Amino acid sequence: MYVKLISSDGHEFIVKREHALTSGTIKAMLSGPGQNEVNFREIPSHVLSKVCMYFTYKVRYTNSSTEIPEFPIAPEIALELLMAANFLD
Amino acid sequence: MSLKPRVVDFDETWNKLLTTIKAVVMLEYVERATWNDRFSDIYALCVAYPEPLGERLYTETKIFLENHVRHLHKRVLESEEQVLVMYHRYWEEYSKGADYMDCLYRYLNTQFIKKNKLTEAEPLMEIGELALDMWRKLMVEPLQAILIRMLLREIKNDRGGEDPNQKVIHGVINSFVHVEQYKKKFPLKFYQEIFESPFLTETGEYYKQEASNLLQESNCSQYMEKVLGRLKDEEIRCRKYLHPSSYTKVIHECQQRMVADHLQFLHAECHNIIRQEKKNDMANMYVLLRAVSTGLPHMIQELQNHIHDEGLRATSNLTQENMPTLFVESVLEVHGKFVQLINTVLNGDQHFMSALDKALTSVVNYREPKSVCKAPELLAKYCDNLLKKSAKGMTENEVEDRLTSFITVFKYIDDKDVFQKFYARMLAKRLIHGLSMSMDSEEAMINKLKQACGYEFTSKLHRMYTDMSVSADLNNKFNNFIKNQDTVIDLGISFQIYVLQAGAWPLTQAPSSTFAIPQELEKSVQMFELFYSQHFSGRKLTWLHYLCTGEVKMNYLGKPYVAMVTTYQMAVLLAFNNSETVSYKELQDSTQMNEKELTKTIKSLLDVKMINHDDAESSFSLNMNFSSK
Amino acid sequence: TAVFNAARDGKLRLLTKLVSSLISEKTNGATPLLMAARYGHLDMVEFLLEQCSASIEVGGSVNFDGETIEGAPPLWAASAAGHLKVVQSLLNHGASVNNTTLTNSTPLRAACFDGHLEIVKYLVEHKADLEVSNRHGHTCLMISCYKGHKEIAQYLLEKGADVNRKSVKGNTALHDCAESGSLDIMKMLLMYCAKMEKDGYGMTPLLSASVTGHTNIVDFLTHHAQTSKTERINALELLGATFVDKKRDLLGALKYWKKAMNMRYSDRTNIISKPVPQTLIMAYDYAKEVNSAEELEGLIADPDEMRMQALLIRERILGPSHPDTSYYIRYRGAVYADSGNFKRCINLWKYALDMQQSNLDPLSPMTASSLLSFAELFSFMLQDTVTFDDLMGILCKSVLEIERAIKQTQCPADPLQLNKALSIILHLICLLEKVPCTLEQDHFKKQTIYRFLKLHPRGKNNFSPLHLAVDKNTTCVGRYPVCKFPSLQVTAILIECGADVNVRDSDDNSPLHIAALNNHPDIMNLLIKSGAHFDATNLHKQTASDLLDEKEIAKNLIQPINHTTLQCLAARVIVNHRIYYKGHIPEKLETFVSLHR
Amino acid sequence: RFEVKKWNAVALWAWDIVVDNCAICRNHIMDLCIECQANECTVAWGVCNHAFHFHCISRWLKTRQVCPLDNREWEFQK
Amino acid sequence: MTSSQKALMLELKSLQEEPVEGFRITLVDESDLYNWEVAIFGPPNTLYEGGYFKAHIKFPIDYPYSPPTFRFLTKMWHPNIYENGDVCISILHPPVDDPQSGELPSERWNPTQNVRTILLSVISLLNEPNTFSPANVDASVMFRKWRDSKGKDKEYAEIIRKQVSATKAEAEKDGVKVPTTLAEYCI
Amino acid sequence: MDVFLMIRRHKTTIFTDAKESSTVFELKRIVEGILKRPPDEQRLYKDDQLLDDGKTLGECGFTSQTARPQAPATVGLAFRADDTFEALCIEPFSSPP
Amino acid sequence: MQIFVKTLTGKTITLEVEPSDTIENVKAKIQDKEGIPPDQQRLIFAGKQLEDGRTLSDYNIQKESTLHLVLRLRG
Amino acid sequence: MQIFVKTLTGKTITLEVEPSDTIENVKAKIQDKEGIPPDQQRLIFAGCQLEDGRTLSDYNIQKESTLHLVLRLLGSVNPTQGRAR
Ligand SMILES: [Zn+2]
Ligand SMILES: [Zn+2]
Ligand SMILES: [Zn+2]
């Protein structure tokens, strides 16, 4: 019930399927010629690490918490993270 | 490599993409290493640094789909007599392939396609919608007539048991409904026109021919089951060949043809059937004729006529000598029998209970050309015969059931007024002389009548009942006035009086004979009048001489006798008290009344001959020669 | 100079005593000299003049007849107040005698406005002009002759003034006299060589005197000749119509119409026909002028025929140019509406509005006032029948007026005037939505509102119609349950019709911002689930959530996580830390991050 | 000679004034009131020869006093 | 089922018989017994030879306690009527006193008034009005002028003749002879 | 309560949760379910604590104020092969411009 | 003579005063017959209200007419 | 020639009004006597109002009369008033 995501430098991230199905592009994959490794040749490690954390945060704090603390995001990865979040959803 | 925009050649990229889309549309094999690799190539194309190439991508995809569709149509039309067997084969692949390849172009659908025409209503479209439009182009400008003709020929195998390929015809027909992407307003127009028009026309023609064939060599009895079986097979045939939304129209057309083309043929046999029983044969005709717009009133009229004739035969002929019980019994029997028949075979239709009510109303209020409607008199006679019960012959509980049944017949008489007056008079005569079956039953009478007809109908009876209920209490609580009258009381006649109202009691005949009053009756009347006036004032108490009946206890003969007799003969005997012989002149002058009543009283006295005669001055005398029990 | 202008402040003991820095001590659009010369403070005026006379001609603001007037010289105010002593004190001190106000108002005009004859002769005996008019070119002679004032008129005439003084509208002094009777000035002006001239709408002074309702000057002009039969006939019919409309006398109307028709018939040689149109009017109950003396008698029994006859006579004689005809038509409609009958009022007002629009400039208070009458009528009639056709028609006329107004070449219409039209339209849409209909009429409503929305209108503070649909200040029109904007229904119709959900006002306030400022979380949810943007930024650094009150955040009717993506957070950080992004990211993403500023 | 032991008889009674109908509630005097008919109450009398209802005369007594035919007075006694 | 409906249905089924002059109970659907419709034949010797004046009567919720209202559809000229067919019958006023007339001498509503007596009162007022309290001053003034003139001025006669001619044409068209024979009028 | 953890060995990272403070045997069982490895052949290194594999996570230091989902915490891992264990080889992420 | 004047109650009671009496006599007779004061009652013959100061010979009612009385009112 | 007036205080005021008069003249007389505002004063005789502009002679007012002055979609329009003036 897990998916495997490979970055553009070698690191492999294993995240649960329901969490990973948030982005529309990942849902576009895993639905086609077959029905578990997804290879991205562009995303660096320091952005793909934060994408999974955002997935976890969004799934966990969906409609339950009364007060949601802010998402920490450094300004040294903002330009690349915007493009990465645009390619995905 | 990075997601930053860059200059893209569009020569190697499109050649790379052409191989994958071709292998995906045809449902071939594509590995997961290249399916994910082909992603982000569209992203790089969409974010080319100078002059992005989204429109070029759209144009080339459209051209590729056009070529593929044209090649498929060429192959399908090239093959002969195997059509509709390869159309399914090339549609099953194409639908799933378009659905899969729509997922590949998700970026181009989300951005650069979302800027389409808004909901203001061809220039731009999504990719799955474009593929479906291309297949529609294949289905409209090339072959439609051959496909429709072969589908109709395959469906035409109805009379024979030849089973066509169920998984092929259904798929072909359901392929027409797949215009769902452009189904903003009208999702079924294409299928509706193209298939629903000639299929309905052919079905109408074929079932007209089948109805003629069946009616040519059959009766009207072994015809309803045949058409019912045909209709029952039609629905199960239509389930596995057509869309869920096209059953009512087909069944309605089939019904319209077979039934509504020959409604005049069925009417003679509907007249024939109702006269006899034919319990099974009525249900088939009812089910058949519930579908046609106007076929039911003829059956309703026939049933009403049959019920009227049967009721008239049952009631009029069976008259006996003079009995009112067979009238109610026969009407109840007819009503119950036909209610049971209707409920058990016509599925409780309301349109026929009205016919039953009309026919029963007609049969219950029949009038002879030279006689009045003699229903209410017999109804009232049944009423008091069921209520007197001073003699044995019934019970104390079956009466209530008889009355509950009787209210049903009572609910049918047109002229209830004459019934009201008749029951008033006869209930009065029953109530005064105290021969009713104890009590707590006339209350059931009045309550049921009030519940059935209303209050103003029963207004003049409840107060009569209360008068009779309170007279006994008044007598019981008033008889002590004699004891508390201070002076001694010398009234030697036992007393029981009844105080009656004025308009409640319908015996208000104006008196015309001033009969004299007995001796002790004078003192009794004076005492009662004064005591009643003291008890309550503001009322004149009239005296009636034609219902007051006393009794005489005689012991002068060998056998003492008790005569329960009205006041006339007591007055006669008191006149005879003074002298043993009394003539007609002093009989006349001892009182003052019409001579007819005096003659009648004298004749009744002589009927058992308690007196003898030795007219104008005839001298009668006491007769000691008469004895009785 | 605190209390000097706050009160009259005579105070000869102290205020008289107190470089003269207060020589021209003026504030709040007012000066001490104006108040000194306003209330007849002779000692204060003398002290101010002796201290410094440099500010003798300084004018400020004053409110004499209720309304405030700006740029009023002290001499102009003193002439109006009647304080003679200050008047010749200033005249001897050397004040300018023709110092006009901001509206070219001479002190002579103010003097003759109230009727101060002695000030008039003293002013005009000191080299004062006579042919100086206001901005609208209304001379002092016309104002003097409007009122009675039949003592200064003769003296001013003897002073040698002109009498033919057409203004921009071409109204003579004879019109002003005829508007208020004054047969003595009639006789005087007629004696001194007066001419009988028309005006902008083509009104003879006799026709104006018949319109205003006076019954003596009309008789005078019935005499004195130089009038044909047609002029006297028209004057008499107009007098009868004015008796029926303005007042409520009917026997006099019978008498006037009887003498008019007797004169019309006259002799067999000279018979005048009745000019009538070839058309029949629906709202007039298809009536016609009774061209028969026999039909005149017995007409007193039915008043409604008289109302139709008077309306027809007024419409024929004057024409659609006047506002009086439309006003009287609407007045009769309102009278019938108050009489409990509602069927004919709608037709009468429909004809009146049709006449109004095809005669007069767009966005005028008359045609604007016409629409709220229909609004109140439909609000009352809904309140404890109504046809779709009438409401659709009136909405169509409103949209037509809006289109004609917005299609002006220069387009100088202020949003203040357009706000009333937009509010009337929205209230009409609500009242329409409160009524059942059919399919084709529903599609017609959708098409009409589509055209109206695509017209691209604007309002106060550069507000879209969608902005007004979700504001609590829109419902100022009427006071009945007109759904009391903001409302779910009107917003839903506007959104489904195709109203843009991301427009901006003058302060870059999206509709979500206005809704949040008016609470109502349901409208916020409806806008959000229609294409709107949750994280938008106005002119300041404020979002839609930061404008919310305590109740909305406490009840938790808006969940932010459901409508927030990672792009939003990245764009917010990029904007807040001022990172250079142009030339490094896609163009659409650049527009996105510009939006999320 | 002859004699007698017991005697039974009946008699009818009616008010000896007019035996008329109530002019207020428009029904016969010996009948129930309409409000009473919506479901035992007696019948009143006046000093005049007129005999009125009981509930009708009370309901109008809540507003005025005198005979509705004679604006003189009311007695209610007998 | 309420006392008002009971009283009105009793009065209707008593009114099924034949009154003298004003009696035409038209098609009341009996779904709402409060709304009625009556026609006036007209007296044989007064100014209304052979007329037919349709009317309308509205019965309040408390019929024996509250008075009803009377309206005329066709417009006539009567010094005691309003413009919209209303009438100023004193009997139709609620019982309360601000000076109008003597309360005691039957100048207001009492429960012993029925539709019959109401109708005869209406005919009596139509035959003989008062000039003390005009309902419309023009008809009051011409009433006084003709009464003093004893037939010199006939404007009132002319307008009444025109109106009765129109209503007689309508009556002769619809269904009824509109009797004026002084013999068929009496029942 | 619900703590959030990252388990990393070389170029690997697995995202998983925990209930409140459970036996590390349960975490090893979850790791085995992900990777099909024997629970007795693991070390489960903290920074330098070595996390004795019999206790609860509450005394291990993992609290609800340290393992928030917006910024998970890390726990090392080193399988001990047939010869011996590793030298706790964890690679770092790339350096962003 | 004999005239059966209709009363408010639905049962007319005849009067046979004399053919040429006065309305005062008629009102007094119906008063003693029913109890309605003369100052309160008002008589109608056929639509024309009859004044109380005249005599019955001025109306020519023959001998079988009908008068319907009503309560006094004014407009 | 003289009729009374029933004011809100109940005092009867005798006014010498001839038949050749009007409601405006009667209002002027009562304003001279007491000073009631015309916008508030009302005229009710025998339960119905007196129309303005209608002479009291045509209203059938006799000697020793009595009048009361109890205090007392729509016409929400005004005549045009746009000139220089
Ligand atoms: Zn009663
Ligand atoms: Zn009762
Ligand atoms: Zn009495």
Side-chain angles (χ1 to χ4, degrees), chain D residues 46 48-50 52 67-70 74, chain G residues 35:
Chain D
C48 280
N49 36 31
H50 332 105
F52 250 67
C67 269
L69 298 95
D70 324 317
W74 186 237

Side-chain angles (χ1 to χ4, degrees), chain D residues 26 34 60 64 68 71, chain E residues 63 65 103 113-114:
Chain D
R26 298 212 184 102
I34 308 95
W60 208 58
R64 293 252 301 251
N71 215 93
Chain E
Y63 166 60
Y65 302 154
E103 233 294 354
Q113 286 292 89
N114 42 16

Side-chain angles (χ1 to χ4, degrees), chain C residues 6 18 59 124 185 208 228 298 364 459 465 540 582:
Chain C
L18 249 55
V124 86
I185 330 168
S208 64
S228 325
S364 160
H540 300 186
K582 265 217 50 179

Side-chain angles (χ1 to χ4, degrees), chain C residues 155-157 160-164 166-168 170-175 177-183 185-186 189-190 192-194 196 198 200-218 220-230 232-233 235-244 249-254 256-257 259-261 263-266 270-271 275-286:
Chain C
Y155 164 72
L156 201 186
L157 179 142
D162 206 24
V163 84
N164 309 317
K166 324 312 201 53
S167 161
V168 50
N171 39 15
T172 82
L174 212 53
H175 287 192
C177 192
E179 205 156 353
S180 281
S182 322
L183 224 39
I185 330 168
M186 271 295 138
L189 269 43
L190 199 55
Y192 164 42
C193 213
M196 192 66 187
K198 304 217 210 325
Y201 319 86
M203 328 180 55
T204 323
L206 177 48
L207 299 195
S208 64
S210 285
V211 157
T212 184
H214 291 54
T215 183
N216 37 13
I217 164 175
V218 300
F220 186 33
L221 262 306
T222 311
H223 314 94
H224 181 52
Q226 83 219 78
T227 50
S228 325
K229 288 174 52 212
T230 167
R232 314 178 280 260
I233 288 310
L236 281 186
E237 321 315 340
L238 218 45
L239 189 48
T242 50
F243 259 123
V244 170
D249 183 328
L250 305 109
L251 200 53
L254 272 274
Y256 274 147
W257 287 6
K259 47 182 332 179
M261 249 167 230
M263 161 171 36
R264 210 200 250 192
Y265 274 163
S266 166
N270 164 7
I271 296 168
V276 278
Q278 64 273 58
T279 38
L280 260 53
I281 294 332
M282 173 42 181
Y284 287 9
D285 229 6
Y286 310 95

